Scaffold this motif. Structure first.
Motif, PDB file in Angstrom:
ATOM      1  N   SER A  34       0.797  -1.263   0.000  1.00 40.77           N
ATOM      2  CA  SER A  34       0.000   0.000   0.000  1.00 40.77           C
ATOM      3  C   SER A  34       0.835   1.324   0.000  1.00 40.77           C
ATOM      4  O   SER A  34       0.506   2.240  -0.757  1.00 40.77           O
ATOM      5  N   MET A  35       1.914   1.409   0.806  1.00 42.88           N
ATOM      6  CA  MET A  35       2.942   2.485   0.706  1.00 42.88           C
ATOM      7  C   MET A  35       3.720   2.574  -0.657  1.00 42.88           C
ATOM      8  O   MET A  35       4.027   3.680  -1.113  1.00 42.88           O
ATOM      9  N   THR A  36       4.028   1.428  -1.294  1.00 39.82           N
ATOM     10  CA  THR A  36       4.696   1.355  -2.622  1.00 39.82           C
ATOM     11  C   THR A  36       3.752   1.860  -3.761  1.00 39.82           C
ATOM     12  O   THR A  36       2.575   1.489  -3.830  1.00 39.82           O
ATOM     13  N   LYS A  37       4.322   2.669  -4.669  1.00 39.25           N
ATOM     14  CA  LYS A  37       3.647   3.120  -5.913  1.00 39.25           C
ATOM     15  C   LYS A  37       4.304   2.396  -7.141  1.00 39.25           C
ATOM     16  O   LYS A  37       5.306   2.904  -7.656  1.00 39.25           O
ATOM     17  N   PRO A  38       3.813   1.218  -7.640  1.00 41.34           N
ATOM     18  CA  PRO A  38       4.492   0.456  -8.717  1.00 41.34           C
ATOM     19  C   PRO A  38       4.182   0.998 -10.143  1.00 41.34           C
ATOM     20  O   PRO A  38       3.073   1.463 -10.429  1.00 41.34           O
ATOM     21  N   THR A  39       5.187   0.918 -11.027  1.00 43.14           N
ATOM     22  CA  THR A  39       5.110   1.514 -12.388  1.00 43.14           C
ATOM     23  C   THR A  39       4.750   0.392 -13.410  1.00 43.14           C
ATOM     24  O   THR A  39       5.605  -0.403 -13.812  1.00 43.14           O
ATOM     25  N   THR A  40       3.473   0.357 -13.831  1.00 43.84           N
ATOM     26  CA  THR A  40       2.970  -0.579 -14.877  1.00 43.84           C
ATOM     27  C   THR A  40       3.331  -0.018 -16.287  1.00 43.84           C
ATOM     28  O   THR A  40       2.920   1.088 -16.638  1.00 43.84           O
ATOM     29  N   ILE A  41       4.097  -0.785 -17.083  1.00 42.47           N
ATOM     30  CA  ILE A  41       4.570  -0.347 -18.424  1.00 42.47           C
ATOM     31  C   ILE A  41       4.080  -1.425 -19.437  1.00 42.47           C
ATOM     32  O   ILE A  41       4.611  -2.540 -19.439  1.00 42.47           O
ATOM     33  N   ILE A  42       3.125  -1.084 -20.325  1.00 42.84           N
ATOM     34  CA  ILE A  42       2.660  -2.010 -21.401  1.00 42.84           C
ATOM     35  C   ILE A  42       3.475  -1.705 -22.700  1.00 42.84           C
ATOM     36  O   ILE A  42       3.555  -0.560 -23.152  1.00 42.84           O
ATOM     37  N   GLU A  43       4.067  -2.757 -23.289  1.00 40.94           N
ATOM     38  CA  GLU A  43       4.865  -2.669 -24.543  1.00 40.94           C
ATOM     39  C   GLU A  43       4.368  -3.722 -25.584  1.00 40.94           C
ATOM     40  O   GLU A  43       3.562  -4.609 -25.287  1.00 40.94           O
ATOM     41  N   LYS A  44       4.855  -3.595 -26.831  1.00 38.50           N
ATOM     42  CA  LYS A  44       4.525  -4.523 -27.951  1.00 38.50           C
ATOM     43  C   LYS A  44       5.812  -5.029 -28.673  1.00 38.50           C
ATOM     44  O   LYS A  44       6.871  -4.392 -28.642  1.00 38.50           O
ATOM     45  N   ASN A  45       5.690  -6.186 -29.346  1.00 38.25           N
ATOM     46  CA  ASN A  45       6.796  -6.791 -30.141  1.00 38.25           C
ATOM     47  C   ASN A  45       6.204  -7.248 -31.510  1.00 38.25           C
ATOM     48  O   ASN A  45       6.349  -6.536 -32.506  1.00 38.25           O
ATOM     49  N   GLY A  46       5.506  -8.398 -31.547  1.00 37.12           N
ATOM     50  CA  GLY A  46       4.697  -8.825 -32.714  1.00 37.12           C
ATOM     51  C   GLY A  46       3.571  -9.737 -32.206  1.00 37.12           C
ATOM     52  O   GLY A  46       3.765 -10.950 -32.103  1.00 37.12           O
ATOM     53  N   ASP A  47       2.439  -9.126 -31.797  1.00 36.52           N
ATOM     54  CA  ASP A  47       1.396  -9.759 -30.928  1.00 36.52           C
ATOM     55  C   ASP A  47       1.791 -10.106 -29.447  1.00 36.52           C
ATOM     56  O   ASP A  47       0.895 -10.385 -28.646  1.00 36.52           O
TER      57      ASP A  47
END
Length: 132
Positions: A34-47
């Motif tokens: 709950s104290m931690t703020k995590p960084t969600t990063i969505i990326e692509k390659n080929g599907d």
């Protein structure tokens, strides 16, 4: 899936500790996450869609082809069968294991990734702003 592709830092986590107690998570990991703020990063390659949740606990990398169920180990150390598909710009994810199943429904509302975590009578609605 184009509006997902980017860096996203945690802005709000409403009802986080209630969702964590419904799953079975002890008091020190429940309070530090709950104290931690995590960084969600969505990326692509080929599907192959690479969603990287960068936490101060364990960094989880999920690689997914939209309608394909894959076996995955979580940051709380759990085998989970992970089925994510795209519903008109909405990544409807379902992680299922031995009776217990949590849905991680990610939906774009006004340029913000809204991660809706629903398990056993405790929905944690998590607002993330775009840092890309």
């Amino acid at each position: 899936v184009d509006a997902f592709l980017g860096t996203w830092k945690l802005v709000d986590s409403k009802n986080f500790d209630d969702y964590m107690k419904s799953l079975g998570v002890g008091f020190a990991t429940r309070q530090v996450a709950s104290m931690t703020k995590p960084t969600t990063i969505i990326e692509k390659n080929g599907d192959i869609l690479t969603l990287k949740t960068h936490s101060t606990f364990k960094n989880t990398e999920i690689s997914f082809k939209l309608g394909v169920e894959f076996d995955e180990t979580t940051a709380d150390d759990r085998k989970v069968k992970s089925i994510v598909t795209l519903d008109g710009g909405k990544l409807v994810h379902l992680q299922k294991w031995d009776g217990q199943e949590t849905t991680l429904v990610r939906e774009l509302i006004d340029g913000k990734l809204i991660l809706t975590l629903t398990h056993g009578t405790a929905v944690c609605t998590r607002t993330y702003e775009k840092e890309a």
